[PDB]
Specification:
part of a larger assembly; 6 chains; A mainly alpha (224); B alpha+beta (83); C alpha/beta (107); F alpha+beta (98); A: 224 residues; mainly alpha; three-stranded antiparallel sheet; two-stranded antiparallel ribbon; elongated; F: 98 residues; DCoH-like; two-stranded antiparallel sheet; 3 helices; 5 strands; 27% strand; binds zinc ion
Chain lengths: 224, 83, 107, 145, 297, 98
């Protein structure tokens, strides 16, 4: 009986899910436009943890000698101590990590951090680390702006809906919110330099891959 | 009721279903002695030919995608990204 | 809006749709002792302007009958005083996208 | 019961709470009892959930009844499949259950318009069904060199 | 059929169901089918301009109809017609015809309940046209009068007028292929006991249906273009070509024997009751014809 | 067993295999061809293929016409339904006059 009731629902090339009448059952399939074969359980890091621990891991304060990026992390490290306009960006990234954590604690009241999402970022990073033979003993040549603005730009290309109007834009941004929290938590500045140690070249490859993989997770029109 | 080439809002990636149906329509025609567009660097098997065709982007076909309300977009095989 | 303590009469309640355009809504008090739109399972329902609605339809390219429905006497619809033909946007939390919006049109 | 809740320093902790559980249901009235939290009251009767709190809150109850069934056996099915079901059950605004010549006569008199998207109708007509591989048309690319 | 057609070729994307009005049936006919015979002009075992070739099909090998030619094989079949001396019910809809009858006033043809009622304004709102008919019929089957004045929503000291008439309504019963009305004046007080049974001729039903408002029959699930109520009553009857018949001719024969002799009676002047009984054999043979065409397969 | 029933069909729908589903559930009952008025979708069209004349007597129309191919069973099925005063009208277009 369930097969007879659902048999006609299909995904359409607008990404909507509809019955044989064309009625809308869902405005995007699964609320996220993904195929469930391309989704894996990942932990959303912002959500858990004490407030002290979250601010050791993610806060970069370039105006403070205790709380900046050690210069062994980064080639620019000496030169960014006390720099005021980088610290504006980095404040903006932290404010976004902070909101992220609050948002997610309202979504997941319980605190459950592990949830299926597309694009297994940890395994892309571990690959980048093998593939670029990455020495944990050398500052990286990544810059602050490379990270910060590179991660913002990537979000603009994780596309599930493509319509030029506002409405479709909002839908697009709502579709990709939770993946974008996972993303900003994983590629935040202090993690990229201090935990992952990426180079520029590795980091650039991490991104372009997250993007290809994300795009290949989108469900295909026509699926029943 | 047709949607101009610009302004197209559906994916630029080919879907598994389009891919399957392409390869298979083209191998049907290869199988009935239709002219081939690609170098047979050995292959005798029509599906396999077809796929080399798809890979060299030499399959001159167009996918007409209907939207639920009757309107449609035309995407050429050439242009669809194959991932 | 008129709130009453335990009933109205078969023929009182007949005086209600009665002075168009001006509408009249009745509530038992007990239904109001608790605010149901504060309950965790009830997500945020937002009445769209008739413009909003025009836009919604144009961008999905839908007819009105292709939208999901909410009935006139749905509790939340009573609570927001919706009228037939009006659309709410429902914005819900979602374990797969975090946020998701859907829409129902009143019947 | 244990309830995971953020602690003053930010990490999640257990905090036990007493909870009551009943045989029988009267949601509209028990909701109103002084001393309870009316925002977190529940019942496994998703019909009553829809009658008092509305279609959306019914949808979410219904999902959570179906999920419970599936998980109580110990298995795990991705969200979207049970989401789809539950949407189909609640898109007309209520909870709708999912469980020949004669009929064509009725079609006649009603002026039934068959959309022709199903697999049987397409079979009778000698066609493919606009599903999957049939949900687009393939055409000869006269625009190419 | 390996021969060529300049008519562009396409798949079917929509099927639209309805009924054939008698206009459209006369409209796409070739032949008027009147004699009920195959072959022998007096006595020539060859072909007759009356049933069988009068422009529809052909066994014969002859790549011939009415300048549409092609083989006894790539010919669709063409469609015949037979004008019917009297209206008869379509057997398939007797029970529908009976329920419409129960929702409409049987003198003016106007819906027994309307906007002013309310239990009926909820039934009118229903979207599914099957559940809507269902629901309005449930509210009207009861209604034994065609009101004139009715309490309005508003300040009920006052009444308000509707399309009126005031006539009492039968209680209708099914007695095979005949519908039977029974009128009263009350439910047994003073003023009038003993109903007045009386059969509902096709004739009058068909006439009441033709008087029902587009608004009103739409409200009942019918459609102004594809399906009007009146088309449930046959007046003009489609004659399939020989592709359809593999012994259904033996039965349309017998229709015409009956159509021929209902007309030769109406012609002769002839008693009320003979005309009626010939009317009823017409009906039975038209009904037998289709309840036989439940041969689909 | 050794069949292809309701459940098998459903699996093939899930995979999206429409061509397979059409091949397997067809008739070999041949694809008969037929002309169809585009106004009244009926198989009423008189097709003079040799002098190239196509008319709907009744829709008064010789421009809007199509060809279709359908199983013979279906061409019967439909003429059966016309015999019973039901119109099963085949249109080539979905979205209409509007
Ligand atoms: Zn012919
Ligand atoms: Zn009347
Ligand atoms: Zn026509």
């Amino acid at each position: 009986r369930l097969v007879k009731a659902l048999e006609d629902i299909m995904v359409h090339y607008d990404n909507t899910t509809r019955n044989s009448l064309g009625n809308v059952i869902q405005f995007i399939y699964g609320e996220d436009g993904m195929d469930a074969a391309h989704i894996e359980k990942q932990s959303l890091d912002t959500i858990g943890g004490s407030d002290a621990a979250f601010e050791k891991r993610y806060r970069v304060d370039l105006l403070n000698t205790d709380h900046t990026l050690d210069p062994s992390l980064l080639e620019s490290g000496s030169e960014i101590l006390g720099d005021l306009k980088l610290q504006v960006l980095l404040d903006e990234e932290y404010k976004q990590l902070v909101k992220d954590r609050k948002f997610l604690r309202e979504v997941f009241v319980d605190g459950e951090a592990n949830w299926p999402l597309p694009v297994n970022i940890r395994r892309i990073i571990q690959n980048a680390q093998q593939t670029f033979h990455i020495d944990h003993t050398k500052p990286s040549d990544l810059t602050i702006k490379d990270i910060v603005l590179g991660v913002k730009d990537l979000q603009e290309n994780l596309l599930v809906l493509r319509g030029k109007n506002e409405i479709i834009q909002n839908a697009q941004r709502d579709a990709v919110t939770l993946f974008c929290c996972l993303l900003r938590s994983r590629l935040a500045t202090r993690r990229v330099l201090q935990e992952y140690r990426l180079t520029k070249q590795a980091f650039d490859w991490v991104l372009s891959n997250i993007e290809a993989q994300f795009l290949r997770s989108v469900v295909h029109p026509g699926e029943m | 009721k047709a949607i101009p080439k610009d302004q197209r809002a559906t994916t630029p990636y080919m879907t598994k279903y389009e891919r399957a149906r392409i390869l298979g329509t083209r191998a049907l025609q290869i199988s009935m002695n239709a002219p081939v567009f690609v170098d047979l660097e050995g292959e005798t098997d029509p599906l396999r030919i077809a796929m080399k065709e798809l890979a060299e982007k030499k399959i001159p076909l167009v996918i007409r995608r209907y939207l639920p309300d009757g309107s449609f977009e035309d995407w050429s095989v050439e242009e669809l990204i194959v991932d | 809006i008129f709130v009453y303590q335990n009933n109205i009469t078969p023929s009182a309640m007949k005086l209600v749709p009665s002075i168009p355009p001006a509408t009249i809504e009745t509530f038992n008090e007990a239904a109001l002792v608790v605010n149901i739109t504060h309950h965790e399972l009830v997500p945020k329902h937002i009445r769209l302007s008739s413009d909003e609605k025009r836009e919604l339809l144009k961008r999905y390219r839908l007819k009105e009958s292709q939208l999901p429905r909410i009935q006139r006497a749905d509790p939340v619809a009573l609570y927001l005083g919706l009228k037939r033909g009006e659309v709410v946007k429902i914005i819900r939390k979602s374990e797969t996208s975090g946020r998701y919006a859907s829409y129902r049109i009143c019947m | 019961y244990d309830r995971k809740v953020p602690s003053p320093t930010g990490e999640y902790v257990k905090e036990p709470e007493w909870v009551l559980e009943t045989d029988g249901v009267n949601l509209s009235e028990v909701m109103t009892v002084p001393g309870i939290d009316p925002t977190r009251i529940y019942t496994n009767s998703f019909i009553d959930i829809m009658e008092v709190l509305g279609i959306e809150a019914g949808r979410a109850a219904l999902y959570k009844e179906v999920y419970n069934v599936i998980a109580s056996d110990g298995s795990y099915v991705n969200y979207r499949h049970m989401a789809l079901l539950v949407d189909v059950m609640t898109t007309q605004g209520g909870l709708t259950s999912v469980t020949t010549v004669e009929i064509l006569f009725e079609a006649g008199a009603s002026a039934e318009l068959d959309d022709c998207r199903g697999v049987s109708e397409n079979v009778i007509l000698g066609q493919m069904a606009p599903i999957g591989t049939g949900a687009f048309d393939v055409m000869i690319d006269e625009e190419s060199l | 059929g390996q021969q060529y057609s300049s008519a562009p070729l396409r798949t079917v994307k929509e099927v639209q169901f309805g009924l054939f009005s008698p206009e459209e049936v006369r409209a796409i006919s070739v032949a008027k089918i009147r004699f009920p015979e195959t072959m022998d002009e007096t006595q020539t075992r060859a072909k007759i301009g009356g049933l069988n070739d009068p422009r529809l099909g052909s066994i014969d090998r002859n790549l011939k109809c009415q300048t549409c030619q092609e083989g006894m094989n790539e010919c669709p079949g063409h469609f015949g017609h037979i004008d019917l001396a009297k209206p008869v019910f379509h057997v398939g809809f007797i029970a529908k015809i009976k329920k419409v009858c129960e929702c409409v006033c049987m003198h003016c043809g106007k819906l027994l309940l309307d906007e002013h009622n309310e239990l009926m304004r909820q039934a009118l709102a229903i979207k599914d046209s099957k559940k809507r008919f269902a629901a309005i019929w449930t509210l009207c089957k009861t209604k034994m009068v065609c009101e004139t004045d009715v309490p309005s929503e508003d300040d009920p000291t006052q009444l308000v007028s509707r399309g009126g008439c005031g006539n009492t309504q039968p209680t209708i019963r099914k007695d095979g292929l005949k519908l039977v009305g029974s009128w009263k004046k009350d439910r047994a007080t003073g003023d009038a006991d003993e109903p007045e049974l009386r059969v509902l001729s096709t004739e009058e039903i068909l006439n009441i249906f033709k008087h029902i408002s587009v608004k009103d029959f739409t409200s009942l699930g019918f459609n102004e273009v594809f399906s009007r109520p009146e088309w449930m009553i046959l007046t003009c009857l489609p004659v399939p070509p020989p592709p359809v018949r593999p012994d259904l001719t033996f039965k349309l024969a017998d229709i015409l024997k009956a159509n021929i002799s209902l007309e030769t009676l109406e012609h002769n002047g002839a008693p009320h009751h003979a005309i009626e009984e010939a009317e009823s054999l017409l009906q039975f043979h038209v009904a037998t014809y289709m309840d036989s065409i439940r041969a689909r397969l | 067993g050794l069949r292809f029933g309701e459940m098998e069909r459903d699996c093939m729908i899930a995979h999206g295999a429409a061509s397979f589903l059409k091949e397997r559930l067809m008739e070999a009952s041949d694809a008969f061809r037929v002309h169809i008025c585009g106004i009244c979708g009926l198989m009423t069209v008189i097709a003079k293929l040799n002098h190239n004349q196509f008319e709907c007597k009744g829709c008064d129309n010789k421009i809007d016409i199509y060809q279709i191919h359908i199983p013979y069973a279906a061409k019967l099925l439909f003429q059966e339904l016309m015999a019973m005063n039901i119109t099963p009208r085949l249109y080539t277009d979905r979205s209409r006059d509007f």
